[PDB]
Amino acid sequence: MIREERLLKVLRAPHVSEKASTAMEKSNTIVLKVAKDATKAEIKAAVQKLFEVEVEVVNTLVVKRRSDWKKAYVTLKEGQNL
């Protein structure tokens, strides 16, 4: 299933973009910069271990720019740290 060196690389940054603020304060959901491959199953596995929170669902999309950057919307349960 997992090898930790991959979880440490599957996430690349947090992402701040106004709808990223409204994703949290309205809809218990955090917005991330993830690997150019990744997959939703790995993105959930990375957040649930690095950030110690339960995850409900992960949805993904891309900026359509030269570096083809993968955004992830990770929805949490009820309470969160950051």
Side-chain angles (χ1 to χ4, degrees):
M1 192 181 153
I2 59 177
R3 177 278 209 285
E4 185 178 79
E5 202 210 272
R6 179 58 176 181
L7 301 192
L8 298 174
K9 297 177 193 175
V10 156
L11 309 181
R12 288 180 67 170
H15 183 76
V16 289
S17 61
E18 330 94 70
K19 198 178 178 175
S21 330
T22 316
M24 293 173 52
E25 64 173 285
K26 195 185 186 297
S27 317
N28 210 234
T29 297
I30 63 172
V31 185
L32 290 123
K33 175 137 196 186
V34 305
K36 196 174 181 298
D37 55 347
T39 183
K40 298 163 182 171
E42 291 184 296
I43 297 163
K44 171 171 176 194
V47 182
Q48 296 196 136
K49 256 68 55 157
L50 277 46
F51 302 78
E52 298 178 74
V53 282
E54 293 189 272
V55 166
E56 186 65 313
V57 64
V58 188
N59 299 352
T60 53
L61 60 79
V62 165
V63 298
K64 305 179 183 175
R65 304 181 184 181
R66 173 59 187 95
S67 296
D68 224 20
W69 173 44
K70 193 172 198 140
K71 173 181 304 179
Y73 297 87
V74 175
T75 300
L76 305 181
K77 293 290 191 165
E78 256 287 276
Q80 75 292 288
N81 50 19
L82 284 306

